[PDB]
Homo-oligomer: A and B are copies of this chain.
Amino acid sequence: EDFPRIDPIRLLDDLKTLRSFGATGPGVVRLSLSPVDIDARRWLAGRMTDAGLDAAIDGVGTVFGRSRKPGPALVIGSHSDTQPTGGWLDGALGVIYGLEIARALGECEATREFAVDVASWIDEEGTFSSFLGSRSFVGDAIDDSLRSARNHEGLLLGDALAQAGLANTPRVTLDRKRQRAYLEPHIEQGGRLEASAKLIGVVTTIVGIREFQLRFIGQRNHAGTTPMAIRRDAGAALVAFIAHIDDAFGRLADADTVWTVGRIDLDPGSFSVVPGKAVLHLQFRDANPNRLHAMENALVALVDEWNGQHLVRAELIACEGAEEPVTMDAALQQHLAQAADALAPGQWMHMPSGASHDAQVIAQHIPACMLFVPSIIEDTAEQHIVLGCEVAARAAARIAGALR
């Protein structure tokens, strides 16, 4: 069995060239449809063309390089837009991996026939509308976004596209008869891969998410003259309630469950005033839908129990944008695991993705999978960038070969 061979110098050169579009100190500033982002997309489309793909920036700003080869296709990609404080490998890694994998599989006689498409989905980070590109590709609803989405400066997405020259450009869309699998390589800086000192992660599931505000309504009072016994301190209620959350969630959790109080506000927030109101922001995530729902039910029950006992009233508010867990395709995961075991024996693991990605959108329509490399100024050692691409290329060869 002959396997393809990536060119590690070519891979790193392209990653560093993409970094130069928007490089700002230790990171990259490249917001969707900004002039520097469009510049990077034109460069990327040229590189896809150089590789022999049919490439263009589409009507929403996605860069898509379609194979010219017949038969079933594997799509490899990620995003190349950033947040205001982006790093040089978030998103860029999987886009350039996809390009190099397309090149390497085309250069190996045994894999030369395999169709590989490469994608940079526009606006994964949501400068205008989160996952605009992957939503557009799979045919999810985008009409509201195209009509009324704005960025931080209030610039309409529709106006941004016209300014980028994309106003009358067709959008690339999924062809379910042709495109049969999706692979998204991505960094992980969060820590699980790093904390395990492993080099390769095979993603099992992209976690679901819940967000809530929890409000506490008590009574303002003078902090000096009001005896402790008659107080209705909303901030004291809030702090006590967090311990109830930790207890109930700890009973339901496994080692991967996460939950976070990201914000606490006391009103009025003065030394000499017992707070009459208080609010916390709560997020939690888990890969297991039963557990995620049981955590929500436990939180609802905690609020009802609290309100049956205490003078400070508790009020739970669901935030828009809850997400369910999204599993990665089991057979694709196993191709990734076989490649990881072949090329990184003893240095790979299965793990959930604690963050959201375009793959969570695409996976609901075609088989999808993700491959993680660790990140430690976001960064990854060059030899680990190379190893990640070697594993991804080997798996891609096997995945694409299996489609026939």
Contacts and interface: CB of A to CB of B under 8 A. Distances in A.
Interface stretch (A101-109, A175-183, A226-234, A392-400): A226-234
Contact of A223 (B222, B253, B255, B262): B262
A357 to B, nearest CB: 11
A207 interface: yes
Nearest to A212: B271
6 contacts: A223-B258, A224-B283, A224-B355, A239-B239, A262-B273, A264-B264
A266 B258 contact: no
A294 interface: no
A283 B223 contact: yes
Contacts of A207: 224
Interface in A161-186: none
Contacts of A257: 228
B355 A222 contact: yes
Nearest to A213: B271
Interface in A206-246: 207, 209, 211, 221-230, 233, 235-236, 239, 242-243
A195 interface: yes
Contact of A354 (B188, B191, B225, B263): B225
The 5 closest A-B pairs by CB, nearest first: A190-B225, A225-B354, A224-B354, A223-B260, A263-B269
A265 B267 CA distance: 12
Contact of A195 (B211, B227, B355): B227
A272 interface: yes
Contacts of A263: 266, 269-271
A45 interface: no
Interface of A: 188-192, 195, 207, 209, 211, 221-230, 233, 235-236, 239, 242-243, 253, 255-266, 269-275, 281, 283, 285, 353-356
A269 to B, nearest CB: 4
A283 B271 contact: yes
B266 A225 contact: no
Contact of A230 (B195, B261, B274): B195
A64 to B, nearest CB: 28
Given A190-B225, A354-B225, A262 B272 contact: yes
Contacts of A230: 191, 195
A288 to B, nearest CB: 15
Given A228-B259, A263-B266, A272-B283, 7 more contacts: A190-B222, A222-B355, A224-B356, A235-B264, A239-B242, A239-B243, A264-B266
B255 A274 contact: no
Nearest to A195: B230
Given A230-B195, A262-B273, A225 B355 contact: yes
A261 B236 contact: yes
B262 A269 contact: yes
A281 B271 contact: yes
A191 B227 contact: yes
A353 B222 CA distance: 12
A74 to B, nearest CB: 26
Contacts of A229: 255
A116 B255 CA distance: 75
Given A235-B264, A263-B270, A271-B263, A228 B258 contact: yes
Given A264-B264, A281-B271, A190 B235 contact: no
Contacts of A261: 233, 235-236, 239, 266
Nearest to A278: B264
A36 B283 CA distance: 52
B226 A258 contact: yes
A188 B235 CA distance: 24
A321 to B, nearest CB: 10
Contacts of A265: 264
